Amino acid sequence: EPVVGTGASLSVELGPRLLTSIYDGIQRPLEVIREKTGDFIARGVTAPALPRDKKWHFIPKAKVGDKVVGGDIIGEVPETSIIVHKIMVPPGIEGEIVEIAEEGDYTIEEVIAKVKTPSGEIKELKMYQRWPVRVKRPYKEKLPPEVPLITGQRVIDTFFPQAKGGTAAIPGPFGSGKTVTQHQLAKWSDAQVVIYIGCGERGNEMTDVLEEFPKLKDPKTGKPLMERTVLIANTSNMPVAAREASIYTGITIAEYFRDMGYDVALMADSTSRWAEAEGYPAYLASKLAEFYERAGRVVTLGSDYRVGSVSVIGAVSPPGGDFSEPVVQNTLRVVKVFWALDADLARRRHFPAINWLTSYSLYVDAVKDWWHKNIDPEWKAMRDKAMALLQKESELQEIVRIVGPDALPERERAILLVARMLREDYLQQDAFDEVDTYCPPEKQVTMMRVLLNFYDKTMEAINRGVPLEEIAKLPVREEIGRMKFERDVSKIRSLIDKTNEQFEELFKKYGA
Numbered sequence: 283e284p285v286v287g288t289g290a291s292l293s294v295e296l297g298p299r300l301l302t303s304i305y306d307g308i309q310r311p312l313e314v315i316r317e318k319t320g321d322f323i324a325r326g327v328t329a330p331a332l333p334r335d336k337k338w339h340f341i342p343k344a345k346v347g348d349k350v351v352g353g354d355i356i357g358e359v360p361e362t363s364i365i366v367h368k369i370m371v372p373p374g375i376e377g378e379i380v381e382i383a384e385e386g387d388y389t390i391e392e393v394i395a396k397v398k399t400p401s402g403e404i405k406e407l408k409m410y411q412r413w414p415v416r417v418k419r420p421y422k423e424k425l426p427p428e429v430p431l432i433t434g435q436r437v438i439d440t441f442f443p444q445a446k447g448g449t450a451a452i453p454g455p456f457g458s459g460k461t462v463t464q465h466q467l468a469k470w471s472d473a474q475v476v477i478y479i480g481c482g483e484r485g486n487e488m489t490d491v492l493e494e495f496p497k498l499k500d501p502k503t504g505k506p507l508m509e510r511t512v513l514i515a516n517t518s519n520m521p522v523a524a525r526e527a528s529i530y531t532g533i534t535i536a537e538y539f540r541d542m543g544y545d546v547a548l549m550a551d552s553t554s555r556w557a558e559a560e561g562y563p564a565y566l567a568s569k570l571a572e573f574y575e576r577a578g579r580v581v582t583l584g585s586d587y588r589v590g591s592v593s594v595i596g597a598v599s600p601p602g603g604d605f606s607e608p609v610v611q612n613t614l615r616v617v618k619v620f621w622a623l624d625a626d627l628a629r630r631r632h633f634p635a636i637n638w639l640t641s642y643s644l645y646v647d648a649v650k651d652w653w654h655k656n657i658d659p660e661w662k663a664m665r666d667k668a669m670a671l672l673q674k675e676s677e678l679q680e681i682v683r684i685v686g687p688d689a690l691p692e693r694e695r696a697i698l699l700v701a702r703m704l705r706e707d708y709l710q711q712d713a714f715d716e717v718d719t720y721c722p723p724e725k726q727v728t729m730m731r732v733l734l735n736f737y738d739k740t741m742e743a744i745n746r747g748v749p750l751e752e753i754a755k756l757p758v759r760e761e762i763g764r765m766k767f768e769r770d771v772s773k774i775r776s777l778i779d780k781t782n783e784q785f786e787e788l789f790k791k792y793g794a
């Protein structure tokens with residue numbers, strides 16, 4: 283109960299009823315009290331993490347005489363209408379199943395299986411397990427980044443992708459009302475389970491968490507989002523030790539769902555705060571690295587080949603306006619993706635307000651082959667080409683700030699026209715629209731083809747004396763501006779041929 287080292291069993295419970303729960307930094311339900319210290323040990327107070335009274339349906343998935351290892355799945359429990367809970371042998375336990383519960387209803391303290399280890403010790407297995415939050419749950423192998431976390435947000439999926447098992451940062455307050463991508467990511471990413479550490483601490487970012495989240499829908503199923511979510515609260519009311527520990531608790535819970543074969547998204551909030559008071563400054567930064575090192579897509583423990591994932595999205599909010607010290611410089615050395623939410627884009631109402639010049643993803647090469655093989659062989663070429671055009675536009679805009687626009691040749695005016703179309707018809711996305719709130723991979727590449735083909739044809743036309751003013755008012759342009767609102771991808775695809783012919787009608791009219 284007490285003991286020396288790093289804590290004496292600072293841990294979490296894992297079994298049916300993690301989903302829909304609201305918790306604190308150390309897994310106590312709807313607001314409890316005070317913990318102290320760390321670096322050595324810690325003290326606690328009363329609350330039961332998972333209900334012992336509630337009865338769960340257990341479907342056995344193994345028989346007497348089955349050999350099992352850590353992570354093997356011995357049964358299933360239908361926990362919400364979205365998520366089947368997978369009952370696994372805890373890590374470090376192996377042997378022969380000598381006893382196993384029949385199908386039926388059971389509380390979580392009941393013994394649903396027994397394992398005889400090779401030395402003969404009999405281990406009793408319940409529907410839940412405990413794990414020290416500060417030790418990475420083990421796995422067979424950490425796979426290299428390969429499969430994108432598909433977000434359905436064009437700028438992210440196309441230009442700044444996150445891999446499943448990857449690490450990403452975004453400017454913080456998740457509760458910030460100036461942006462909604464943080465909410466788009468939670469509901470649309472193709473993770474089955476979300477672990478959310480909303481440490482919104484005061485007023486308008488705290489009671490909006492309670493009794494809206496229960497009404498929030500999971501757009502994929504119609505059912506509520508909380509049926510595939512675990513909330514971890516981090517209020518100003520709470521002790522600084524439980525706040526600190528909350529991310530370790532969240533990522534341990536994420537890892538546990540990963541181990542079942544789920545893709546999970548862990549979203550960690552953060553606030554403009556005074557975190558102050560081992561060779562320090564550098565040490566905390568080294569420990570943060572370790573937290574982010576727990577993200578990954580893995581072959582999980584178990585006898586079946588099984589893959590699961592934890593992807594991390596961390597909020598970042600410096601004390602001041604400037605993104606220099608505390609959290610931001612230290613976070614940006616470890617994360618492979620930064621989505622630079624930009625107050626000046628927001629005021630211009632360019633939405634998602636993601637600065638396409640200051641954001642970055644180091645996963646582009648990691649994920650390209652998944653796109654090429656599954657969606658479009660030209661994904662990476664198109665993406666690179668569109669970015670180069672965005673870079674060119676920005677270089678041109680700088681020059682035109684100095685000398686103005688009147689001296690622009692047709693060619694540069696043309697680059698400006700097409701870059702503007704890319705920004706308006708592709709980067710900008712309407713999270714409030716029934717269609718455009720999510721953009722499937724197949725739609726993203728077709729929209730990109732339409733735009734780049736219009737670019738090719740624009741430059742071909744300039745190259746042949748067609749005035750730009752004639753191209754600017756080509757009727758298909760306005761259809762290109764509305765294609766994000768079209769569900770039918772084949773109708774978007776048809777814009778390619780329509781662009782081609784309209785341009786032919788222009789080559790003709792000029793003898794070009």
Ligand SMILES: Nc1ncnc2c1ncn2[C@@H]1O[C@H](COP(=O)(O)OP(=O)(O)O)[C@@H](O)[C@H]1O
Nearest residue numbers: 460461462463623624625628633634635712713
């Ligand atoms: N249709 C939309 N799609 C995506 N985001 C939207 C939409 N409408 C509004 N927004 C949000 O506005 C945000 C702008 O963020 P911003 O306020 O610049 O962050 P910061 O806190 O750094 O200023 C975008 O992330 C975007 O979510």
